[PDB]
Design a protein around this ligand. Sequence first.
Ligand SMILES: *P(=O)(O)OCC(C)(C)[C@@H](O)C(=O)NCCC(=O)NCCSC(=O)CCCCCCCCCCC
Ligand SMILES: [Mg+2]
Ligand SMILES: [Mg+2]
Ligand SMILES: [Mg+2]
Lengths: 220, 115, 87, 69, 123, 87
Amino acid sequence: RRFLSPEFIPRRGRTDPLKFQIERKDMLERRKVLHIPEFYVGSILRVTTADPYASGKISQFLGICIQRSGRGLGATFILRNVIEGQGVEICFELYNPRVQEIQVVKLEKRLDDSLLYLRDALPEYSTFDVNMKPVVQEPNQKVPVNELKVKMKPKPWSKRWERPNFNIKGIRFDLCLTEQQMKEAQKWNQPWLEFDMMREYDTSKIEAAIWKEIEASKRS
Amino acid sequence: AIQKMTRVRVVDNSALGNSPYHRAPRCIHVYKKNGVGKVGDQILLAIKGQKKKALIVGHCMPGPRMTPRFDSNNVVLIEDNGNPVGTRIKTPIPTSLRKREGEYSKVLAIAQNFV
Amino acid sequence: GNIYRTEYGLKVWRINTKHNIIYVNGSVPGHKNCLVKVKDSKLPAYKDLGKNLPFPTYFPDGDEEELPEDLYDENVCQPGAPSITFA
Amino acid sequence: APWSREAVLSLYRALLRQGRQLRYTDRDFYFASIRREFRKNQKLEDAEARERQLEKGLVFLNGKLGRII
Amino acid sequence: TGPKFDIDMMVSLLRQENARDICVIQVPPEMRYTDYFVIVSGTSTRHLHAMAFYVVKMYKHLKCKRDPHVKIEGKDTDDWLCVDFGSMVIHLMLPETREIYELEKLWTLRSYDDQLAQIAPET
Amino acid sequence: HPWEPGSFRVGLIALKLGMMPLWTKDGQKHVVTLLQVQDCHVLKYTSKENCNGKMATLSVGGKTVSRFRKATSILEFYRELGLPPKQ
RNA sequence: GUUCAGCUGU
RNA sequence: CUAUCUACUUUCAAAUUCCUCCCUGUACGAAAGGACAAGAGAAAUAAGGCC
Ligand SMILES: *P(=O)(O)OCC(C)(C)[C@@H](O)C(=O)NCCC(=O)NCCSC(=O)CCCCCCCCCCC
Ligand SMILES: [Mg+2]
Ligand SMILES: [Mg+2]
Ligand SMILES: [Mg+2]
């Protein structure tokens, strides 16, 4: 089981393949200087950056990863934490040269690929100790999947998390939504969407070619 | 981020900010030509039946990369001469204020946490 | 749309000699994979800075040390450079 | 007596010792300012509160959060 | 001809200008603000403006071109002036204003400060 | 010839590959556009008198394209030059 | 009944 | 306006503005007072584009 960082896989489009090869070369060179670890949405990270506004003094922000988005050199991830009761989010750029270190304090996967609903969840689910110690990751073991289901705050939420389009599975809807509210959400359900074969984007061949480039760079 | 009528949270320890009032503090004027307030922008507030200048230290709207985004729209009260009404700030404030154009050393001096 | 437009004064951050790629600041008109006309900036501030540029053009056949794969601007952070600090 | 009356007195002597090795800070200002905190603000307190003040003084003595030159 | 503008130089200038209660705090690198925090008392508003310009006048002299320029803040106020050089932040405050804010405690007791213990200025 | 003040050298035709983030040592981000030069050649030279302009003109060609979709007259021009047709 | 609080592409 | 007629549907791209710093405590200024451009940064608007 080998993990390919999501930003390496390009999105569908008409971009010339050479553009991705050139960008992947720059990405691999930056990875030699800075070790970018494997992490997922739901993992706890501590990111160290040099502060331009504080004369380059290093800054550390610890938070749970709630989103990984972007492709290529610009790919980003958002870390969320509650500091002094204030919810804070920072969108970090993986390949920004300011980043000194990216440490995975805890490596795990949550039920959802996005945790933006944590903004609407109880503050405890977004509160992580800034001085917590890294838990060891056993060699050659599957990434643990955290099955926690969060309890939400009273509506209205930032987004209608119950609607099928989000496909959220990490919220205790039964505690916060009545049966009628749940059924009303199903109106927007699109059963045909999952069976639209032409919408499928198969990256198996693309990922295989990328791995050859990744291996070539490591050898040289 | 902050516009006229935007409700704001006072994050200093000033009596005016922390005093209980039925009406939440609301922005009534933004001191920018476009009327859109960002971090490090002064505004006028309607707080406890008074008009007090405030400085935006945090807002919900997403900013540039590597910058903190806050759950609430945070402001600190300042006098007309620029002195802060409160003596302490406990809510984390961004460090980008230091190099933003304008006077922010007074606010940074009373800030306990930086993010 | 679908008309000719010019973006003036875009600096060349980096040059890739192997793939013949010019890294130019900001954005240029047109869709990706379109053909664009690139020319020395006509803006008055950038006048007479061609003293140090290949004239009439760059001949790689000519007798000179082969250029490195990438040419960078003094301020560009190169991919393999160490993580920057502002001290 | 947060933990002991010797601890508070020991802290007071310790801080005064630091005040005599101040390269830049006005030693007169440092001593008077230290006096005000111990003499007035915290001299009369209760059992529970006393502990917080002693921990505050120890944090000041260590100087890990901030040091007075 | 190499006298750099450092903390030792600034305290010399401040003492030369009759600074009443110089307090230099060494701010640790973890606190991402400045290397040194300086709080000076002044006899009057006229005194604060004079010593504020003198330190900035000497700084402009003893600085490199690459070093950024500095701005005196709080000129609108009469009690409190501050100058953020970059590695040193000097706050020039009147005696009464200095007591109200207790900046010495805040920067020496970041999270243990009394006022930050919910002792808010309700006065 | 050597470069002289007031000289105007030729430019080139490039293809727009896309955009990338670029960072500078001062910690600023810059988005750049990648322009790739594909089969760019000089095609024609016209002197000042014949060009009906103050300055002489250099015609430059861009991406190589199929000869099967070009006009006969254009196909004859490239045949003399000895280069595949341009887009 | 307002004010207030709350929600909304007004 | 279910728009018959007239007119019109790319004058293609020279840009304005406010603030801070700087010049400068310089020129002037009995003196106080205090430049102007030259620049630097930061904003906003407008125009043109872009992901
Ligand atoms: P005595 O009768 O033998 O003893 C008197 C006692 C100790 C019994 C009496 O004072 C008492 O009951 N005290 C209660 C507890 C106490 O005193 N705690 C100690 C307080 S520690 C303190 O105040 C530390 C202050 C830290 C901030 C200092 C700021 C200095 C700024 C300098 C700027 C240059
Ligand atoms: Mg919303
Ligand atoms: Mg209302
Ligand atoms: Mg537009």
